[PDB]
Symmetry: C3
Subunit: 256 residues, 3 copies
């Protein structure tokens, strides 16, 4: 299962069932969980934890140091959950002590070829990062978010649950939950109604969220005005609280 | 020896005369490689895949991987590559899907530059140039002599017409007619590839007729049906204009405007 | 030992005594590596290439390949890289073409991040940062301390001035004067890199003179030649203004506006 042309550092820790292809490097302090398949020509560096039933494709560099000059070799980590697919040539950097010293990925994420997950980024669950998507650093991607091909995300930006970025988008401000954004610079267009139907949202939840978008984007309310107007919608629908919570946590302004 | 002993050749792989395979390359099951093809070092070939003659594939390329667009792959789905193609460093080419074509198809004399992506069920003709990090999302048709400049992004099902040209960083969401130049995100028509026509040995007559054809379609408020009617006479005189007319006719989902 | 036994070292290669080469790396014929340099695993070095001292080259980089540019027909051309450079994952650097000076040149203390592309005949100075997926198409000159943010695209023959800055996703088709800040596709001139200038310790007087010089070129309706003639005075007083003036005077592709 561990190909004999692979290099497994002695301090690495591999569960039963783990496969490692030829000419891959499982570096010092790299933990891998049961059912995970490392392809050929993968470089893993630690300290890193990889969970269960993950698949990591050739030419990926998972757990290197950020080249960002504000990192100076301090002990920082990367954690990856379960049932993720990391495709060809993905780069994933460990955290920096200036934040939480950890880069974090949840479960059931699909990270397509040549995607870049910068230091200190947090990815939730059931996210899709399409080819060459780049998180510059300290980027938070909530559950079910889809970033289309060559989406560039600026440092510290929050990408909301069920949000969608069009291909070649450049995101400089928080994207609220459910919002669809396009272009360079990114601008809000609508709500991810497909994402909501994928979730089996009641038709009352979807109408509540359709109206919630109007209150924030199409009624000339300021962010403060919107948040108060949404309070009752948010009380009634957990799905609208996700939206309101995402705008409330947007300390530096939302994508318009 | 032409086959480096550090490469992994599957027993079902078929290598023709004068094929070279560099060290640490994988030639997987049902991969066929034609006469005089050079596989670089650190290349992953996955099948079922048919590669023709006098191709060159550079290091860190993943040729014939399954699309990650489906959670559960269909099999068998094919990749077909013709002759005299250059595939540069880190290029990804995905096989077809059982739902659509079941084949990703590349013709002859194409240049696919570093880190370009050719998505499942795409079709590339002959003499095309995909510059660095060009991405064909899926079911993209690129006709003969098209040039896509660096970091050109193409949406699913879009047709890139013969002799067309995309500018650097273009995001293409609708068909590009033959000969048309497009720029920006989202892509906008600007003119025709007059430079390319001259390098192809197009008559000044053909080039003048194609200039007029551009104005008929884009500049004169015609419906497409009206544009097709207005172009019929010029298309019958010039095969070069027929290629333009046919790219407009075949564009069911609209053209880049 | 410092050379991994799984690395390929061409017998013509010249390595200083403390050079490290990781496993499954290639040091090709006529590649020279200076003292203190670390080559990671899975690196492809092709020559004729000279690499200086205390460099670091990461996995999956292709350093010294021929350009795929059709104008290159296999002529003997070179790559020269200086000292204290960092080349991150998957970087591509191509040798020169005889049509220019048969050399691609990189100075010292440069940071070239993952999947950056340095095209044939490019000249990079000292203390430059090319962020992820920056692509220099060919014959691009990047002068000292320039910062090109992520996915910056540079057209052939463009010059990037000293202490200039590009925003993420910039598409530069025209020359960027020294100190100027550009953004967008196509790239737009916004301001000067005042945070760069202050971090580097430029004087308040030089920063004020550069602030006024920006107005002269961009905001007084002067033609390039009229602005150069108006810059004459301040350029004689402040070396920094002369660097600015010179970058406008040396422009081949017009200046980013
Ligand atoms: O972009 C993709 N799908 C998609 C589906 C619906 C709307 C949009 C939309 N609208 N505006 N910009 N992108 C986009 C897509 C899917 C799979 C891919 N694989 C590689 C690439 Br590049 C890619 C791109
Ligand atoms: O739901 C998707 N796209 C979506 C959803 C809502 C509005 C729009 C919209 N609006 N204007 N243009 N595109 C688009 C979707 C689903 C599965 C996918 N797999 C890969 C990709 Br990219 C993707 C995208
Ligand atoms: O940009 C390229 N060619 C080209 C030629 C003529 C007009 C234009 C145009 N005009 N406006 N936007 N792009 C573009 C080009 C050629 C070779 C290359 N190799 C690597 C890269 Br990135 C690259 C880019
Ligand atoms: O672009 C980056 N940083 C940056 C810093 C300051 C201003 C701007 C700016 N402002 N407006 N447009 N771009 C941008 C950056 C830094 C590190 C990275 N690592 C991977 C990627 Br992609 C990346 C991108």
């Amino acid at each position: 299962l561990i190909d004999p042309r692979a290099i497994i550092d002695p301090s690495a820790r591999l569960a039963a069932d783990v496969q490692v292809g030829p000419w891959s490097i499982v570096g010092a302090e790299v933990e891998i969980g049961e059912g995970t398949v490392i392809g050929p020509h993968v470089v893993l560096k630690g300290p890193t934890k990889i969970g269960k039933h993950n698949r990591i494709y050739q030419f990926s560099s998972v757990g290197e140091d950020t080249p960002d000059l504000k990192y100076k070799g301090e002990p920082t980590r990367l954690v990856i959950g379960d049932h993720n697919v990391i495709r060809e040539g993905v780069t994933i950097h460990r955290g920096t002590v200036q934040d939480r010293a950890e880069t974090t990925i949840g479960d059931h994420n699909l990270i397509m070829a040549y995607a870049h997950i910068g230091h200190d980024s947090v990815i939730g669950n059931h996210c899709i990062l399409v080819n060459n998507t780049a998180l510059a650093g300290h980027v938070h991607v909530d559950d079910w978010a889809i970033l289309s091909g060559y989406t560039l995300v600026h440092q510290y930006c929050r990408i909301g649950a069920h949000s969608f970025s069009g291909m070649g988008s450049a995101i400089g401000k928080d994207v609220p939950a459910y919002v669809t954004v396009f272009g360079n610079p990114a601008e809000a267009r609508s709500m991810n109604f497909e994402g909501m139907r994928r979730r089996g949202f009641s038709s009352e939840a979807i109408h509540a969220l359709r109206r919630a978008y109007k209150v924030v984007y199409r009624q000339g309310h300021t962010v403060e005005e919107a948040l108060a107007e949404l309070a009752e919608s948010a009380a009634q629908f957990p799905e609208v609280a996700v939206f309101r919570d995402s705008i409330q946590s947007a300390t530096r302004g939302i994508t318009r």
